[PDB]
Amino acid sequence: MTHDNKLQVEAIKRGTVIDHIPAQIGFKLLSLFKLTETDQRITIGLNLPSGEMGRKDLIKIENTFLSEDQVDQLALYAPQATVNRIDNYEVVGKSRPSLPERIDNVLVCPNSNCISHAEPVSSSFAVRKRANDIALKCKYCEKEFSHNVVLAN
Amino acid sequence: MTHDNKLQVEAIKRGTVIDHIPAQIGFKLLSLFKLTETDQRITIGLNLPSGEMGRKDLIKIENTFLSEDQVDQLALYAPQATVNRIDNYEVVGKSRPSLPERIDNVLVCPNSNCISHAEPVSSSFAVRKRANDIALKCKYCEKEFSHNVVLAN
Amino acid sequence: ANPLYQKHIISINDLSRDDLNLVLATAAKLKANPQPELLKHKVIASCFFAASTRTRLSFETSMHRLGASVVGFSDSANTSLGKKGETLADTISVISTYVDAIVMRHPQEGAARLATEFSGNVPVLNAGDGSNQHPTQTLLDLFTIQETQGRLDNLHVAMVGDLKYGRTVHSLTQALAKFDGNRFYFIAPDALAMPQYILDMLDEKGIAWSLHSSIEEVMAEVDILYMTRVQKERLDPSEYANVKAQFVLRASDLHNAKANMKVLHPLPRVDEIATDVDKTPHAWYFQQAGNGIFARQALLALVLNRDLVL
Amino acid sequence: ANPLYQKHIISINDLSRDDLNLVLATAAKLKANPQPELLKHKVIASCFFAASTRTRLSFETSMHRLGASVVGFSDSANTSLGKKGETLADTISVISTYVDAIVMRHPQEGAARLATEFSGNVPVLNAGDGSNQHPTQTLLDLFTIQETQGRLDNLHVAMVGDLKYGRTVHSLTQALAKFDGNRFYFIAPDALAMPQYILDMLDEKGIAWSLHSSIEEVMAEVDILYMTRVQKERLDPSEYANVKAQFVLRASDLHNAKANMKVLHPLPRVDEIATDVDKTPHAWYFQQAGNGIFARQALLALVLNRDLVL
Amino acid sequence: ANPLYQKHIISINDLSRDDLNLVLATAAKLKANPQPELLKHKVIASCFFAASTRTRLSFETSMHRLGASVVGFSDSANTSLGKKGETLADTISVISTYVDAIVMRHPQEGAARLATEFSGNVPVLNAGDGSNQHPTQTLLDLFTIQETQGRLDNLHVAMVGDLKYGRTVHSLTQALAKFDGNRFYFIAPDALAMPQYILDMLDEKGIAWSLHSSIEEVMAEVDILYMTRVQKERLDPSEYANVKAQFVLRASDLHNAKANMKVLHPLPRVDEIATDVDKTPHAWYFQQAGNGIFARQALLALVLNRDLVL
Ligand SMILES: O=C(O)C[C@H](NC(=O)CP(=O)(O)O)C(=O)O
């Protein structure tokens, strides 16, 4: 259901729709939660101005269905975006990335003497509302870090 | 003289439009070219269909035009890929990537003992076609490797 | 069963005052009447991937002092991990199949954590994991603080030395921050300063804490002076200006000392404390050392015995 | 007295099915009801001239799990042999005068043999002598094979990895070759191939064995898959092409796997097995590890107790 | 001007027959009519980042033979590149501002080429860059072959030894491929055979080469038996299987060899040439080492001098 100006069949029978992604954030996400490592018909719109959002990135996958967890994780890079559970072409549910408990596998502890590097285990940070940002606490080393300084796999 | 067959198109007013991109090489391109930086709206057709070409990746970049060398190294990545220049909502230019003579600054000489690693210089291989694959000779170590191996850097 | 039964003692962040209080109680109990046979038939593994005199030895005596048998190692250099490229996890995987509990010290952080992921039912006791925790240390500390002060609330506590890398002070600050009205004075080199994440905890808890540039002025209003050696081995070459102790304490400094005040030190000490102090009575680090038996015992006792110790 | 009473367990070549069978039996017995005091008053020496995690630790727990006391060493570097130029024989000469039994692991072959020449009455247990034997290993192996298969005759047994230098597979091939109708498939680098002298034994015995170039085709007809790490430390520089594992096994490979088939590994493993396998049920190497107690126990029990264990 | 004046001699692949012939002809002239002062007032740099006995010295003698002054280092260890951490690019960049030409030997491949990009109009001469090119070798070699055979076409040349890492034969083979009807036999262990891209030129030029598992298959065939040393320094651990000579030449294997045939060797030799050969009238390695003087002067002359007239 996309509105006016020209054509765009960026709308499917089945799939998920990451509306309102802050510009540039689009690309990242695609890699981070590796959303391209599927085979379903993906369609990605980068920097497409809309109105409400001067320029908003945006992604949609065909036949693919986001997990309440998988979803939440986006609350670190685009908490103000909207997921749309598109079934039979019509919106069945409109969700939003809400901050999660902790972010298992896809985040590398910046601590070099962390055991999480040497040994084969899945990364893991607890998430927290520090002040003007999120704080990240390695499951192992117990060192916590800004969600701006921590890097991810 | 207008849009395509399958039902998901958004023809740009001016800009390049890469089609026929072999599967899961559409995202490599997007990165190994830094076309995600720009502001211009971008359209990405991942895992698109083909029937005869199977799944295809297509990149619609609005108002941006591929360097006349950038298409020369794309000659390697997606040889079956086509690039449609577009002006006033139309396919004004039509080009296809032929294998350049030598390519520099992007590939990495697989020879570890190559000076190029240690020293501060720009790579450079000569692109000569064998029978079944392109062979690349590093300009310094003078060793020749098949494009498959030099494509691991 | 008792609260800490079959529980992993990994970080002090996962214990409650009740927990702390329980070990203590049990320490004071066992210190009065020992239970030489309390843990016979049990076999505990003493795994030290890192150096230790106090921690390892005091723990092993504890196990023997309770009829338990001990196996393990002081150096990983001779372990298959040591010479065959084994992984710590697989290491723990096999070891969990042999013994009833695992005591381990390790050069990297969250190492004990890691181990509980493979330890299975077998509880894991952290004897120090990098700059991170040192819970069993804290327990003897508290036991000693209480021994000599009569309480763990409303103390004036000064932590001098390396706090950035001091797992010792990491845990223990967390521990009395679980108590009320505790004044924390921090005297540290600006690079070996105390980590943010410990201060925040203090902030939110509303516990008060204030940096200080010398022992000189904290010295009159402190019950406890916790001294620490500079964790020289964990230092970064850009911190090697700080390898020598900034704050040395001699007997002279203690005139103003509250008569009740004691000097504490995790040990070992290199020059941050001068032997003259050893004579004076505020000096308690060697008594502090002696207390590690009781705590380690109490702990062992609790973790291995369902029914609250007689 | 029992057959293995006061006997040296040096090589599997010197044991009989009856012998093997006896230890097993006794293992399964002690595993059901333990005898915590069976060996009290005894003192056993744990002498490791070589690195070990599993072998040394599992043995020492065994001794403690039977009331025995333990003395010994994990590294010869601190022995007078280590620093005073003593001879292994004289070493064994003095040690035989102190203890009731000697467990030793050593970097060279026939080292345990040697020791029995000076050990005196005191029985010697080989915990591994170079590329040569590893009998106690074999015992837990068999115990495990039988645990999971119900028998030791008529098995399809695939030995992958380093077999030239694998004392582990040296012994164990000899061991089931004492059993009937055992199919041996050998997958090894042409240089880490299995030694002639083990094959001949197989020839004369009429036991069947066939080289294979991949796990892929043996995989459907095997009860046991014995994986081994490349004995990197015994490798010759002209064999360092083979230091990396040729045959890695992942979960993917096990679709065709008989539902009863188990993966075994002496441990440790470096990359010859991928952690995904760890999830799957053919994986038994960590259970395999756990069994070393029982076998080592049974053995200890038999060698030290005249009267057949209750 | 001459075709070589001011040129970089980096790779044989960058020169033509006529370029070669030019040098051998000058070589020839100088060997009989010496030019004591040809390069007088010229100052040349001898920069060896790697060991050399023959190449460095012979070069430097050539220089003095021509009256040029020399300046350089036998080793990078006490250069600011060696201790202060200077890039080679910066290194060639300042040295190029001092001297009249640059003779360079370097352990990495392509070092030669990169210098030219920094030496400005100052010619750079490859005394060897890793296992890539040894151009100056090929010149004294050509010269030496010519001198003994009287031709450079329709020769039967054997190339034994490390061919994969042998920079001397990489360079020698492209040079003889410029001539007519040469016949190549390559005898080397599989781990070290002639690199593909080399053969690719051979084939693609219509030249006839052939591989042989031994020396004595071609012994009465070949005119030149070019022996090479195993480049153990450039060897990979996986290739360490092959560090010993696989084809060794004895003075008895020469029994059926052509009488005009000469044994060459870039040198040094370890054991792949028996000292008894040295006496045989086939042994020619030491004489060719001598011709390095002539080819090398010859070279020096052509590059630094617009018009030579002898
Ligand atoms: O390192 C120190 O100074 C404090 C502390 N030391 C102790 O535990 C005493 P020891 O190392 O003998 O067990 C530790 O964190 O290792």
Ligand SMILES: O=C(O)C[C@H](NC(=O)CP(=O)(O)O)C(=O)O
């Ligand atoms: O070395 C191995 O891989 C197999 C075998 N390993 C074992 O006995 C286990 P560990 O060395 O811990 O005692 C041995 O022969 O040492």
Ligand SMILES: O=C(O)C[C@H](NC(=O)CP(=O)(O)O)C(=O)O
């Ligand atoms: O090293 C060899 O065996 C052949 C050859 N050797 C020579 O150049 C002789 P030298 O090392 O004395 O200069 C080389 O390429 O360095």
Ligand SMILES: [Zn+2]
């Ligand atoms: Zn961490």
Ligand SMILES: [Zn+2]
């Ligand atoms: Zn190169």
